[PDB]
């Protein structure tokens, strides 16, 4: 499904990303926007054999298992298929593990290039949450 801006905002908040390890809700909304345009089925095959799945494009070389990637590790111990559901639970749970690393959100390239440093608060602007 394709979430609406405020809808995802309310969703991510209920799923507890707002101010998770210091990252404001806007950061997560902004990242989802540039990473997948709020599409839970967003999929991208990378030069190697990995693929990014979900609203946050989690990679199949490190975080999830898609059965066709060389050197996979499945750190989130989840099928890559579960990161495509309309229920963002698994996607949020994995994202929390990812950001809990030293380089935090920098793990999301789209976020670095388009959200990092910017006033991401505008992304939840206008939402009554």
């Amino acid at each position, epitope marked *: 499904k394709v979430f609406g801006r405020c809808e995802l905002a309310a969703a991510m*908040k*209920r*799923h*507890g*990303l*707002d*101010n*998770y*390890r*210091g990252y404001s809700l806007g950061n997560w909304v902004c990242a989802a926007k540039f990473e997948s345009n709020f599409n839970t089925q967003a999929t991208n095959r990378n030069t190697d054999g990995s693929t990014d799945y979900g609203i946050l494009q989690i990679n199949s070389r*490190w975080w999830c298992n898609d059965g066709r990637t060389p050197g996979s*590790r499945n*750190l989130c*111990n989840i099928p890559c298929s579960a990161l495509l559901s309309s229920d963002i*639970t698994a996607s949020v*749970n994995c994202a*929390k*593990k990812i950001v*809990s*690393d*030293g*380089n935090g959100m920098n793990a999301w390239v789209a976020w670095r290039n388009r959200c990092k440093g910017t006033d991401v608060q505008a992304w939840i602007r206008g939402c009554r949450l």
Partner: antibody
Amino acid sequence: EVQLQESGPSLVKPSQTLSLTCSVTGDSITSDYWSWIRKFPGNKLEYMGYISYSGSTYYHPSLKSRISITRDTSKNQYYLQLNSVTTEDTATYYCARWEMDYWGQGTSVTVSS
Amino acid sequence: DIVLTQSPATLSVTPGDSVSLSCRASQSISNNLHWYQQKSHESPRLLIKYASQSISGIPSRFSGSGSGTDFTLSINSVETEDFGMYFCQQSNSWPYTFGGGTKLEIKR
């Protein structure tokens, strides 16, 4: 499924450094996030710290930079080293996976001269 | 740091009846609150993660609810092996911290 187990001296002297080993089976050490939690005699639990994939670690400020958490290069075991201990460090130490799902049985260590 | 307070520190219960355990945070932590069961000579066992997400192999009688600063672990129809120590812990901000715990003991 993964299995974990702590091991190291049960007695450590004040000012000496405390070291413990956590052996893991069922999942690669470099393939995950690992933790150390301690439980004091009064039953209170303290989260000591963790190391993640980039090799980055997070230590609890309550430890005043006395803690070091390292992973072995090839044995599939990570370690806990705590400097300048006192009797306040007397406790049961547990290593567990960051997921908080799998824990080691826990091992006791007393600090006394 | 975020302080987690659990009250009462001790709770008496009669097998068959239900109980609710409280865990309050000094700061809102959203859903980043987990519940553990700990028996003597044993490591903590994870019961519920992220305030209400259930864990595989945990009796369905255990359930968690709450958000922000007020959380609750519910044990429907308490059984003999449910007795021991219950702790809550937050992972919203570093350092992760634990609540002081609530003792679940047998009423007689």
